[PDB]
Amino acid sequence: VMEINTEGKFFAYKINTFDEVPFDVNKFAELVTDSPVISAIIDFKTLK
Amino acid sequence: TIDLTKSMATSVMKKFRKSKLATSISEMTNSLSDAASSANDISTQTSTIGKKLRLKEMITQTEGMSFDDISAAVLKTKIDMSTQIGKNTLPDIVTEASEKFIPKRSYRILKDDEVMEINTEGKFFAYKINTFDEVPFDVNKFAELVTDSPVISAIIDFKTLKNLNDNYGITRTEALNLIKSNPNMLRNFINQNNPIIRNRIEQLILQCKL
Amino acid sequence: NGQIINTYQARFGTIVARNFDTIRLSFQLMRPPNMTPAVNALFPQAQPFQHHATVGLTLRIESAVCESVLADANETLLANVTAVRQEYAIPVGPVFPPGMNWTELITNYSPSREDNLQRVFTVASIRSMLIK
Amino acid sequence: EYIENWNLQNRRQRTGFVFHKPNIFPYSASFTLNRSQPMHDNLMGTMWLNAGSEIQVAGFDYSCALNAPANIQQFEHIVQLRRALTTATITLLPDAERFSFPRVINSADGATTWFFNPIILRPNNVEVEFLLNGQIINTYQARFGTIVARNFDTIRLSFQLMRPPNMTPAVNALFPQAQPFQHHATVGLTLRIESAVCESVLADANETLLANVTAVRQEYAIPVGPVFPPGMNWTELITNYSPSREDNLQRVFTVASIRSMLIK
Amino acid sequence: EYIENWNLQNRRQRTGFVFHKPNIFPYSASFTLNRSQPMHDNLMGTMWLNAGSEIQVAGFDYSCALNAPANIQQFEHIVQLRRALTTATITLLPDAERFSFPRVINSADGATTWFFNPIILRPNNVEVEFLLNGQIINTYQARFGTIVARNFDTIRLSFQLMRPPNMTPAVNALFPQAQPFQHHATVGLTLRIESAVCESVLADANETLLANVTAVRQEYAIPVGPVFPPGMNWTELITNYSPSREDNLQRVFTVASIRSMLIK
Amino acid sequence: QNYGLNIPITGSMDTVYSNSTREEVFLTSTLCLYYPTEASTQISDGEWKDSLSQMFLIKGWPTGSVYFKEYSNIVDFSVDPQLYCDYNLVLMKYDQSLELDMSELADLILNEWLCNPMDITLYYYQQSGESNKWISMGSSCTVKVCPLNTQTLGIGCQTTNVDSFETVAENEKLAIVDVVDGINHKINLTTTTCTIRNCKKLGPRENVAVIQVGGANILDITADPTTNPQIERMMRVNWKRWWQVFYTIVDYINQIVQVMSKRSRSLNSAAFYYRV
Amino acid sequence: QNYGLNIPITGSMDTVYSNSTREEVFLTSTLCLYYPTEASTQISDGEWKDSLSQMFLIKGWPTGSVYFKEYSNIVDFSVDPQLYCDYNLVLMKYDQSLELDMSELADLILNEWLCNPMDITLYYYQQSGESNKWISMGSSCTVKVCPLNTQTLGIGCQTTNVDSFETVAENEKLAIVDVVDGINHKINLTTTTCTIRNCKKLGPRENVAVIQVGGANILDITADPTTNPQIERMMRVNWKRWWQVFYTIVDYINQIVQVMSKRSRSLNSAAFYYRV
Amino acid sequence: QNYGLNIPITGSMDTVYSNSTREEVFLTSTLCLYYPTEASTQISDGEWKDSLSQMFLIKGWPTGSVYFKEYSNIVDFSVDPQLYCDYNLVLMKYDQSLELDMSELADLILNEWLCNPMDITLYYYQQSGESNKWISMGSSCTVKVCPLNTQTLGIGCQTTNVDSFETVAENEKLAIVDVVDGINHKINLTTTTCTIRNCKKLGPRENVAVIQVGGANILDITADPTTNPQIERMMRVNWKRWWQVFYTIVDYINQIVQVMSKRSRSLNSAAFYYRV
Ligand SMILES: *[C@@H]1O[C@H](CO)[C@@H](O)[C@H](O)[C@H]1NC(C)=O
Ligand SMILES: *[C@@H]1O[C@H](CO)[C@@H](O)[C@H](O)[C@H]1NC(C)=O
Ligand SMILES: *[C@@H]1O[C@H](CO)[C@@H](O)[C@H](O)[C@H]1NC(C)=O
Ligand SMILES: *[C@@H]1O[C@H](CO)[C@@H](O)[C@H](O)[C@H]1NC(C)=O
Ligand SMILES: *[C@@H]1O[C@H](CO)[C@@H](O)[C@H](O)[C@H]1NC(C)=O
Ligand SMILES: *[C@@H]1O[C@H](CO)[C@@H](O)[C@H](O)[C@H]1NC(C)=O
Ligand SMILES: [Ca+2]
Ligand SMILES: [Ca+2]
Ligand SMILES: [Ca+2]
Ligand SMILES: [Ca+2]
Ligand SMILES: [Ca+2]
Ligand SMILES: [Ca+2]
Ligand SMILES: [Ca+2]
Ligand SMILES: [Ca+2]
Ligand SMILES: [Ca+2]
Ligand SMILES: [Ca+2]
Ligand SMILES: [Ca+2]
Ligand SMILES: [Ca+2]
């Protein structure tokens, strides 16, 4: 899961075990054009 | 820039309500209500079903790319770039963009690992969804199923799936989503910039010529 | 490799090319000195030019010998390879182009592509000895 | 390494030579003008030097993209390697330093000479595409520093000259709306193939084989032969690299290494 | 290699070390003015920088060869290697970078400072000669890019500044015929010894022997000995490279190699 | 020959540029001097055109290639100045109060204006952008511009009332009028006398030089006020004797021709763009 | 330098290209009618220019584009035809006995020309080839030519006496005289009222077009007798009423401009390039 | 917001630009125009304020955001010119013998001046360096300076005799006088009608731009004889009609504002240095 705040901060993290991974811009930029984005009412920080 | 701006939306709608598409959907609804209040043959039947399906596409809310969607996008682009738009132009051109954009199109009904595709011209195929190899068609089953099951606007029709799957080997997920006309995978393929999809999309945009 | 191996002048019909990598076809359009009334009417000295003169050549490589492998009109190796890939819908791999498109494949014919092509062609040759 | 490649090539198996600063590009300094006049007062195009392992390309615009669409001029530069490279470590920097000082350049015809007075804008949305058989093997967008190309046969460097939207009075004075254009905008790139791996033998900044072969040819006044150019000019040897030349070059380089193993 | 050459020298024979980018050149950035005035308005001469394996030269004329005969100004630069190289692959390019941007340079004795404002012409009919004891061992006339020097101890670069006969209005305005000379024509050459083979021992970029030796001498604050200069400054060491100094340098370098075999 | 196409051309930098061409641009082209009548009035001669021709021959130009033209004064020369002639010099004496006329003429004859007619009586004319002006030429060009609202109603002026219009040139022989680019205007200009053309500014005319014979750097070819460029061909020379001026021109004719250039629009290579 | 004339542009017959080079130095192209004054006289109106512009607004020309130009009659308009304008149409009302004058004006405007002046009173002149002519224009041209032997002695005409000279054009506003290519000539005409120029014919001007409003097809731009090509721009109509003519032109204006092509235009408005 | 301190910023040379701020500078600032009364005199109209305002609105400046301020003339406007405004433009009709007065005014307004008082009657004054001047302003300034020895005895003047004093400026509204630096001076200046201030030269005042409507480049803002530069904010334009001048201003107002910039000392950034 690649997550973005509207104020710059960004994260990337697995689903089964929320261990964050290095972010991949130029992959996120390509994905977000097409993929179904999801609002993050439960932020990654609070979720972890 | 314009001083009039006297509800161009309403002005467009006024002449839009009288277009052939509007009166055609009205006649379809009237015919179904009358049926309720009452009491090559295959190619001709499928042509009639295709006309009805075009009306249904206009009426309903489909999750596919929905040819009318491309027609509206091309209309918006042409309207925006063109710099000659009088009071009586957007009326009587939005109608035409509804009528003549993409005169020929095709639709799909997905069913239990198979797919049944129809064309307004008269063409009709049926093929397995996992491996694209056509199977015998059943017009009676198709006419039964078309009234109830949802219709997938075949933006990327089987003529193109066969070529694309055979040459560019596709995975089950991407193939299924292209069959479902998923914008996610369609835009993914255009981002990949493969010639088959590029050619077909350009063919549709050309078909929007009016 | 840049040096002329064979050269022919005003020779038509069948000819030979010993070992050649390029073909230079030079020809000329000479305005005919003497002109019958009809051709004089055809070719004026003013701009309009309703009729456009042309001179052309046709050249068929009937047969040859190539160190590397190519498709032909007598051998079905490329057809067998492409059909085997198409029937099963193989994902496009690193080396060959999509669908064994011969035009792109011969346009870009790097040695890795050549080696893979030779391998699959000889395998198809082996297969054709038993399956047809 | 050289005899190992010789045997791994005698038996048909993949071979590989590791090269530090491989002079893969033949020397070529030139320029393309996509817009020009006899006065050479409003030019626009690219200039480039490809030499050794350096590509150094600078796109220039005299009007600073005054009338380009969205004030963004677009520049492309192709470089077709004569032989494929593998596992290339590359160094990509902006601001091509060669084409970054005033010049006067003889015209394309050779008749007149035109004045070039660069002011270096930043190159924006640069894309470096490493191609093999026309298929993009790698792409790097605005990623400078060291980069890697796993396998590639051609290089497409695309960059852009975007007019500065906001401008200090000084830079506004630099870029006028009129004709004179006493300064000409420029944006450049530099690409250094630090190391690579290749099948066919090449010359290097780390190996002495090319120089040794050329020296032993020059020593005894060997007459100019069929395949090798006169004097073993490496630019002319690499500009067209026929298979006969490749075979002969591998042979002479192998013998050169065999000899250099004893004679220094 | 080092111990092999040590044996080959102890039993007098042909030694040799392969060097990537040798520091054959003592560091020297300087300039000679073949025409000057106290006003320093009209100058003509050559600037140069010799450093490591790099030479840059730039012959400049403030009048752009007007009063000169034939509108062609000759420039010549001599670089005298302290040791003769062999089979040296040498890159040779035009347009010396470091002497192609404006500068203010102290005068011959520091009394004043003069302004230099280059406009880079193309060096025409360049001619690079590689000399051994005065005999032309190699010559290259207008052939940039990679070249080879068979065996040489002096480099003689002879280039020229030709005023462009045909000139567009811009360059014509750049080069007047009156006194002011607000732009100063310049033609430059760059020359890198990419690799070579030296009979004696020198510092490199591939090796770290000089680093190890000087680090050892600096760790313990060894007092300055007779032959090596203070701190083993390589420039001062190579400017005067007498035989005893060379012998001591070879001994310490081979010992440093023996150490670096184990201690890294 | 691929006329009418922007086709990129690749040129190397190792190529040795060719030999001089002054002898060609003298033995072929035609030098062409435009001077005011007061010059000849002060010279007080009439073999002097022949004498200047002989001196030009000594300097290189063949006999028939150097041609002279007179004009009463700058303001009268301003009306329809067409220099049908291969290498043009315009001696231009400077006097006070003619600064704007000098600037207008310099702009007109130094920059290539391409332009279309204007029916003042019928249309409302709007200026596109920075490079568009209206040039009015005649014996008495009294241009009265009345701007128009977005509703085509006048402001400061009444479309039926010529008097309240805003004059921007009175009885000028030549007037390069520049209005607020973006607004429709209704013009009135004396159609029997002065013609007006909606003109816009292509690249420079590199075939015509202007020798200001008098004072300071007052020419402003660029109507923009921010930029005051000093073009190479706007030369300036002091004067106290027309013989000395002409001798300077004759002596340095090589330099003046080097500053100038062959007209781009006259070349065959510009055939299908705007060749003229 | 050039526009890349000396290298070839390649194109694929198997691929439809997509990108186009958007270029414009203009507001927008300008249709432009040249009508005879009898047209307005028969119309007997005077908001008709407004009406026609409004029609062209429907057909797809903005207001400021279409321009209108009255001319008295074709013989008068022939003298120095200044086509000050972009998409030029000339409505030539045919009448008998004006066949040659109509055809000669058509030859002048439909074709590009490159003209030098002819100092008649001093030298003798030849014609280089099929492409050369002499265009004589002015109030009243009366050309009288006298061919000359190799000894510079006239044949059929004494070179001193002018009455013996062979007249070739008698009191024409415009004349395009062709003489025998290779014969030195002495020419006499009324230098005050007429000016003659030695004009080569370049390729055709693909910008102007000629609509013959009246009867039979008689245009012959090519002075050759053998060839009489009918270019697409020699349009013709049958008329009784000028309003009907103008409505025809308006309704079919898109086809007319499709026949024409604006890429051939000159900076100045002259119907012939002038090269001293 | 960490005012006062000089902290070193840091920035990357690879970041990208941002969206243009033209919209903001039109929609938030206030344009401000000073012109001489002869302008309105020649205009002879009087809804021209509204006309110019609406033209400015078409260019993009809201109606209430453009101010006009007539001033009598250069000499009487230079007496304490207060530019309490946001984007200042000062037109100046150049005239003979007002070269120094115009240059003094330009130097006064185009640079930020830090002025302390000067009690002439009590202290003896000095100039710290080249960046220090004495600006005298009033109805009639006649500065008479008497330099002094190191022992407070005059040289070339007696400390008690205003006759012996040396006159440096006489009866002008504005006098930016410089004297030798490091020599004490005793002043006499008519204190009832001409104040004097000891002023220091800070950076340039970008807020205001000067437009010389008349002659040639003369404005030497730098009192140093050596450097006589040409600043971007010192614009020049030729003229015959004030309407044409103002239309040029309105047309190129975006370029003029690009030349200018917001005052460095009007911002909170400059809060605790010399904010004004
Ligand atoms: C150029 O000039 C030189 C001498 O200045 C002469 O030797 C050479 O032949 C000339 N070349 C041409 C092409 O005219
Ligand atoms: C300009 O105004 C005058 C009034 O003095 C009028 O007679 C003339 O017709 C006007 N010009 C045009 C072209 O209508
Ligand atoms: C786009 O234009 C270029 C010329 O710059 C041309 O080479 C190319 O073919 C054009 N595009 C396509 C798809 O052909
Ligand atoms: C034409 O001939 C007449 C009579 O001989 C003569 O008066 C006239 O001058 C001639 N034309 C010219 C231009 O000389
Ligand atoms: C910048 O301007 C462009 C169009 O000029 C607009 O599409 C974009 O949204 C603007 N940027 C932002 C951050 O809104
Ligand atoms: C200046 O001199 C006048 C006499 O001319 C004298 O009356 C006046 O007091 C002096 N000013 C000052 C400030 O002392
Ligand atoms: Ca004027
Ligand atoms: Ca008014
Ligand atoms: Ca304007
Ligand atoms: Ca200006
Ligand atoms: Ca006639
Ligand atoms: Ca006779
Ligand atoms: Ca003839
Ligand atoms: Ca004919
Ligand atoms: Ca005194
Ligand atoms: Ca004053
Ligand atoms: Ca001072
Ligand atoms: Ca100064």
The maximal CA–CA distance of chain H, rounded, in angstroms, is 68
Instruction: State the Cα–Cα distance between residues B143 and B53, nearest whole angstrom.
Output: 11
Of A3, H178, H45, the residue nearest F154 (C-alpha): H45
- Residue H100 corresponds to which tokens in the numbers above? 């120094």
DSSP for chain G, please give it: --SSTTSPPP--SS-----------SSS--EEEEEEHHHHHHH--SSHHHHHHHHHHHHT--TTT-EEEEES-HHHHTSS----SSEEEEEE---TT-HHHHHHHHHHHHEEEEEEE--TTT--B---STTEEEEEEEEEEEEEEEEB-TTS-BSSS-SS-STTSEEEEEEEEEEEE---TT--EEEE--TTTEEEEEEEEEEE-SS-EEEE-SSS-----S--SS-----TTEEE---S-HHHHHHHHHHTHHHHHHHS-TT---SS--SSEE--
Q: E2-10 vs E243-260: helix axis angle to the nearest 10?
A: 140
- Residue G213 backbone phi and psi in degrees, to 5: -80, -30
Instruction: State the Cα–Cα distance between residues E25 and E153, nearest whole angstrom.
Output: 11
Spatial neighbors of G213 by CB under 8 A, at least 6 apart, are G91, G92, G93, G94, G236, G237, G239, G245
To the nearest whole Å, the CA of F61 is away from the closest chain E CA by 18
Instruction: State the Cα–Cα distance between residues B30 and C106, nearest whole angstrom.
Output: 61
Q: Is any atom of ligand 4 closer than 6 Å to the C-beta of G180?
A: no
CB of C2 less than 8 A from some CB of D: yes
CB of E33 less than 8 A from some CB of D: no
Which atom of ligand 6 approaches the CA of H191 most closely? 13
Q: How many of the other CB atoms lie within 10 Å of CB of E148?
A: 26
Of F34, F52, F175, F202, the residue nearest F112 (C-alpha): F202
- Residue G193 corresponds to which tokens in the numbers above? 């009222």
E-assigned strands of chain H?
Answer: 31-36, 66-71, 87-92, 111-117, 132-141, 144-147, 166-167, 172-177, 185-188, 194-204, 208-212, 234-236
**Angstrom distances, CA of residue G156 to CA of E143, G141, G159:** 71, 22, 9
Q: Is any atom of ligand 3 closer than 6 Å to the C-beta of G18?
A: yes
Q: How many CA atoms lie within 13 A of G268 on its CB side?
A: 17
**For B54-81, b where at least 16 C-beta lie within 10 A, e where not — what string?**
bbbbeeeebebbbbbbbbeebbeeeeee
Are F218 and H238 in contact by the 8 Å Cβ rule? The answer is: yes
The preferred substitution site among G136, G162, G196 for testing ligand 4, maximizing ligand atoms within 8 Å of CB, is G162
Are G194 and G142 in contact by the 8 Å Cβ rule? The answer is: yes
Q: Is any atom of ligand 3 closer than 6 Å to the C-beta of G16?
A: no
Q: Which burial class, exposed, middle or buried, applies to G142 when counting CB atoms under 10 A from its CB (0-12, 13-18, 19+)?
A: middle
- Residue G267 corresponds to which tokens in the numbers above? 């900076």
Give the helix/strand (H/E) hosting H192.
none
The radius of gyration computed from the CA coordinates of chain F, to the nearest angstrom, equals: 22
What separation, in Å, do the N-terminal and C-terminal C-alpha atoms of chain C show? Answer: 41
Are G191 and G120 in contact by the 8 Å Cβ rule? The answer is: yes
Are H161 and H221 in contact by the 8 Å Cβ rule? The answer is: no
Contact residues, chain D, for H18 at CB < 8 Å: 165-166
Spatial neighbors of F197 by CB under 8 A, at least 6 apart, are F115, F116, F117, F118, F134, F135, F136, F137, G84
Of the listed ligands, the closest to the CA of F17 is 1
The preferred substitution site among G165, G188, G189, G196 for testing ligand 4, maximizing ligand atoms within 8 Å of CB, is G188
To the nearest whole Å, the CA of D177 is away from the closest chain E CA by 19
Which residues surround ligand 2 with Cβ inside 6 Å? F 120-121, 162, 188, 191
Residue located nearest, by CA, to atom 10 of ligand 2: F188
Instruction: State the Cα–Cα distance between residues D3 and D200, nearest whole angstrom.
Output: 13
List the single residue in D with minimal CA-CA distance to C111: D84
- Residue B192 corresponds to which tokens in the numbers above? 């990949």
* CA F224 centroid distance within chain: 17
Of E198, E207, E192, the residue nearest E51 (C-alpha): E192
Of B9, B1, B19, the residue nearest B90 (C-alpha): B9
CB of E95 less than 8 A from some CB of D: yes
The preferred substitution site among F142, F162, F192 for testing ligand 2, maximizing ligand atoms within 8 Å of CB, is F162
CB of G19 less than 8 A from some CB of D: no
**Angstrom distances, CA of residue H218 to CA of A31, D172, F98, F213, H106:** 62, 23, 18, 20, 11
To the nearest whole Å, the CA of A26 is away from the closest chain B CA by 13
Contact residues, chain F, for D31 at CB < 8 Å: 10-11, 13
CB of F27 less than 8 A from some CB of H: no
- Residue B42 corresponds to which tokens in the numbers above? 């295959």
Contact between F13 and D105 using a beta-carbon 8 Å cutoff: yes
Q: What single-letter amino acid sits at E87?
A: T
Are F196 and F135 in contact by the 8 Å Cβ rule? The answer is: yes
Residue located nearest, by CA, to atom 11 of ligand 6: H188
Experimental method: cryo-EM
Resolution value, angstrom units: 3.5
Q: How would you classify the pairing of strands H234-236 and H208-212?
A: parallel
Gap positions in chain B, given as the residue before each gap (C–N > 2.5 A)?
39
Instruction: State the Cα–Cα distance between residues H34 and H166, nearest whole angstrom.
Output: 36
Are H56 and H27 in contact by the 8 Å Cβ rule? The answer is: no
* CA B121 centroid distance within chain: 13
Q: Is any atom of ligand 3 closer than 6 Å to the C-beta of G9?
A: no
Of D48, D17, D55, the residue nearest D193 (C-alpha): D55
Instruction: State the Cα–Cα distance between residues H178 and H125, nearest whole angstrom.
Output: 12
CB of F195 less than 8 A from some CB of G: no
- Residue B44 backbone phi and psi in degrees, to 5: -65, -45
Instruction: State the Cα–Cα distance between residues B30 and B37, nearest whole angstrom.
Output: 10
Of the listed ligands, the closest to the CA of G178 is 13
Partner residue facing A30 (CB), from B183, B184, B191 = B191
Are B64 and B153 in contact by the 8 Å Cβ rule? The answer is: yes
- Residue F100 corresponds to which tokens in the numbers above? 């704007």
Q: Could you give the dihedral angle defined by the CA atoms of residues A12, A15, A16 and A20, in that order, rounded to the nearest 10 degrees?
A: 10
In the structure, do chain D and chain H come into contact, i.e. share 3 or more CB pairs under 8 Å? Answer: yes
The maximal CA–CA distance of chain G, rounded, in angstroms, is 70
CB of D37 less than 8 A from some CB of E: no
To the nearest whole Å, the CA of G236 is away from the closest chain D CA by 41
User: Whose structure tokens read 């920075």?
Assistant: F130
Are A18 and A47 in contact by the 8 Å Cβ rule? The answer is: yes
Contact between D37 and G22 using a beta-carbon 8 Å cutoff: no
Are A19 and A9 in contact by the 8 Å Cβ rule? The answer is: no
Are G37 and G72 in contact by the 8 Å Cβ rule? The answer is: yes
**For E202-230, b where at least 16 C-beta lie within 10 A, e where not — what string?**
bbbeebebbebbbeebeeeeeeeeeebbe
β-bridge mates for residue E120, sequence order = D103, E186
Residue located nearest, by CA, to atom 10 of ligand 6: H188
List the single residue in C with minimal CA-CA distance to G202: C47
Instruction: State the Cα–Cα distance between residues A5 and G27, nearest whole angstrom.
Output: 47
Are B118 and B53 in contact by the 8 Å Cβ rule? The answer is: yes
Q: What single-letter amino acid sits at D72?
A: I
Q: How many of the other CB atoms lie within 10 Å of CB of G223?
A: 16
To the nearest whole Å, the CA of F255 is away from the closest chain E CA by 9
Instruction: State the Cα–Cα distance between residues F97 and D57, nearest whole angstrom.
Output: 52
Contact between D178 and F9 using a beta-carbon 8 Å cutoff: no
Which atom of ligand 3 approaches the CA of F8 most closely? 5
Instruction: State the Cα–Cα distance between residues F21 and F25, nearest whole angstrom.
Output: 6
β-bridge mates for residue H186, sequence order = H146
Check the annotation: does D133 bind a ligand: yes
Residue located nearest, by CA, to atom 5 of ligand 2: F162
Helix (H, G, I), strand (E, B) or coil at F11: strand
Contact between B191 and A34 using a beta-carbon 8 Å cutoff: yes
β-bridge mates for residue H32, sequence order = H67, H88
Partner residue facing F17 (CB), from D31, D106, D180 = D106
Q: F48-59 vs F242-251: helix axis angle to the nearest 10?
A: 20
∠ CA F205-F234-G273 to the nearest 5 degrees? 25
Contact residues, chain D, for E174 at CB < 8 Å: 104, 115
